Write a protein that binds this ligand. Structure first.
Ligand code: CE2
Ligand code: CE2
Ligand code: CL
Ligand code: CL
Ligand code: ZN
Ligand code: ZN
Ligand code: ZN
Ligand code: ZN
Lengths: 258, 258
């Protein structure tokens, strides 16, 4: 009866509360997606258990094993009933899981340390002094891996073979690498996160250029899941009444520091 | 076998070619959605007939009759198999028809004649000198009609009773009214269209303030339609390979005039 919700620790979507070690269950977490799960759960009338993805990944299909990892894997293999997280709706995932209409719109963007002489993807692609990468097992990397668009194909060719590896295991590590590389590392990630980090101390990073592509985050459920149909309508409802915009302001700007 | 596609004449989505009177069938039309239908049809392998919505409306449910009009009505009542147009994904429509993942993201925006002293929805709502309205039988009007958000509820209260009526039957009429009202009429419409018009002669209008809400356009099919599942995957594919961004640049900017 209790719906298992898989998610991933990613600020400001899901964060441990400062005093989480004294709390149990869902109360240990806070954030935009934790607030969103709370809303969906009560408006849809069900009990749920928030569970952090074991491997801490969003989800990609291994070429060798053909196995899905991350949150996508938890849904594909029956470990979770719904994923409420900043999970990008993409063709390859849509073939194996169901997504609700987008609860948030965004795009791939470039994060640089302030002062870095880069203003766009074209600039990055036509130079080597500034290394750049993205998150492993995420949609951004798969976007670049499968892209045949000139500029993006060139960036992928560079990234897939760059040494040291330009890929990071977590967004936190990518941001930390941008902050500690003295302008020599640019990080490709979704605009929403880029925007979030831009407003967090030490305020030493910035989003440059426009978005490279346009995507959306949706709540995901196993293919042909009964719950998915209802959740999709619940998300549409929450959006129309301004709850999602309200949540965005609360977690991005009301808590900003720059 | 031939899929009936309902659409609406709305530049730059669907426009009659200059020499359409000498052409027949689908060849009479051109535009972003005509290009999009052409893509979906060949990548999904089907013949189709583009058909303009009889009443020229997007679709709303009459309170008295409870009947759906516009393109939504054509799908609900079996007159068309798919609607390929700038049809906004909304809760009330989602209850009766199926939408693909968004092929375009946008939001409600304000269109004003250049020079009009209005910079936001709050400004409009706290004054009466400048009348403002939206399109009848569209999602923007239903957004305002059902909204309980303070500012939007106040604007709806004003609009529903304003005299002369602030509602227009077509986007063309709303834009014309903005252009001929000498700053005394502001028009609420989706940002994509606002952006389009801003780049068309006489270049006397402009989009002001940020978007009031965030929405998406999806391709619509009758509920539980087999075609919908496949089209949704086709749209996801087209987006990932940059066809939609390519189409946007072609119909909005490559043809701009301001
Ligand atoms: C963590 C986040 C959200 C900033 C992100 O930034 N670049 C990405 O690839 C992702 C993950 C992506 N949303 C997904 O679902 O794989
Ligand atoms: C014509 C267009 C697209 C500019 C528009 O602008 N305001 C609206 O309500 C609509 C129609 C809407 N997209 C719909 O589906 O009802
Ligand atoms: Cl490597
Ligand atoms: Cl009236
Ligand atoms: Zn609620
Ligand atoms: Zn290496
Ligand atoms: Zn094609
Ligand atoms: Zn009247």
């Amino acid at each position: 009866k209790t719906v298992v919700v898989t998610t991933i620790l990613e600020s400001p979507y899901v964060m441990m509360k400062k005093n989480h070690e004294m709390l149990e269950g869902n109360e240990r977490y806070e954030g935009y997606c934790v607030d969103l799960a709370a809303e969906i759960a009560k408006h849809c009338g069900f009990k749920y258990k928030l569970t952090i993805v074991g491997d801490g990944k969003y989800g990609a299909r291994d070429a060798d094993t053909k196995i899905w990892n991350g949150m996508v894997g938890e849904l594909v293999y029956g470990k979770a009933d719904i994923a409420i997280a900043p999970l990008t709706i993409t063709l390859v995932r849509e073939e194996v899981i169901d997504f609700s209409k987008p609860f948030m719109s965004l795009g791939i963007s470039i994060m640089i340390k302030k002062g870095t002489p880069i203003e766009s993807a074209e600039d990055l692609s036509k130079q080597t002094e500034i290394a750049y990468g993205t998150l492993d097992s995420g949609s951004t990397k798969e976007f670049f891996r499968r892209s045949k668009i000139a500029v993006f194909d060139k960036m992928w060719t560079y990234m897939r073979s760059a040494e040291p590896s330009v890929f990071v295991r977590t967004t936190a590590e990518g941001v930390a690498r941008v902050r500690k590389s003295k302008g020599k590392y640019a990080y490709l990630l979704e605009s929403t996160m880029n925007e979030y980090i831009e407003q967090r101390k030490p305020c030493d990073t910035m989003k440059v250029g426009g978005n490279l592509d346009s995507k959306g985050y949706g709540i995901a459920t196993p293919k042909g899941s009964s719950l998915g149909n209802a959740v999709n309508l619940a998300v549409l409802k929450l959006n129309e009444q301004g709850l999602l915009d309200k949540l965005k302001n609360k977690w991005w700007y009301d808590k900003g520091e720059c």
